[PDB]
């Protein structure tokens, strides 16, 4: 047969020792694959969260901005009506000051006239 | 004591078991390297997303710094205008009072002038 009993028993023990190594290797790789898929699950969980935060930061920024534009607009309207009031009041104060000057000019004339006339009453 | 034939057949049985376990080693090796590479792409996506996250937060912080200063400045002009409105409204009231007084002074001076012209025959 060419191979004797002793030669085949020796080969059989070599194949058994090789099965033992390959079984150990299968066990080691099953354990690495398991830990690797666990780590994959944590990274997909992390990615999703980072994205959920990105999306909420972006909507928040849009509501805040619309809110800000509404209060800036209302404050500007209050400022502009106050500034118009300043200019209107300035303009009425000036027309009134001008009237008062005419009135005082008339009063000056009327006081000169009563003086002239009182001197003439003192001489009749 | 096993015969040559029985041992040859066991030899072949052990070779088939070896061939199965070599297929299982190669299957596992390929799933693992696929999963290691998928994890490395996820860690590169996480890095990028967090960097963007950092940049937005810094841009937002300085943006709200600038908005708050613009609003404080506009509120400051409004308050100053209001102070001016109050003061000017008081000065206006005083000038209007003076106007009314002067019209009464004129009306009485005119009556007096007329009475004096009578007296002097003018």
Numbering used by the authors:
A (entry chain B): 19 to 142
B (entry chain A): 20 to 141
Copied sentences from the primary study:
Inhibition of the protein-protein interaction between NEMO and IKKβ represents an attractive alternative strategy due to the crucial role of NEMO and its selective involvement in the canonical NF-κB pathway. We have previously reported the design and characterization of a coiled-coil stabilized NEMO construct encompassing the IKKβ-binding region fused to two ideal dimeric coiled-coil adaptors, at the N and C-terminus. Here we report the structure of the unliganded N-terminal domain of NEMO, utilizing the coiled-coil stabilized NEMO construct modified by four additional point mutations, designed to improve solution behavior and crystal packing. The crystal structure reveals that NEMO folds in an irregular dimeric coiled coil in the absence of IKKβ, with discontinuities in the heptad repeats causing an underwinding of the supercoil in the ligand binding region.
NEMO-EEAA is a homo-dimeric, irregular, parallel coiled coil of ∼175 Å in length. The regular coiled coil extends to the first two heptads of the NEMO sequence, to residue Ile65, and resumes after Phe97, encompassing the last 15 residues of the NEMO sequence and the C-terminal GCN4 adaptor. The interhelical spacing goes from an average value of 7.6 Å in the regular coiled-coil structure to a maximum of 11.5 Å for the stutter “heptad”. The helix axis in the apo structure, between Lys90′ and Val104′, rotates towards the center of the bundle by about 35 degrees. Consequently, several of the side chains now occupy the IKKβ binding pocket. The only accessible pocket in the unbound conformation of NEMO is pocket II, which represents the point of maximum opening of the bun and where CASTp locates a pocket involving the same residues contacting the ligand in the bound form.
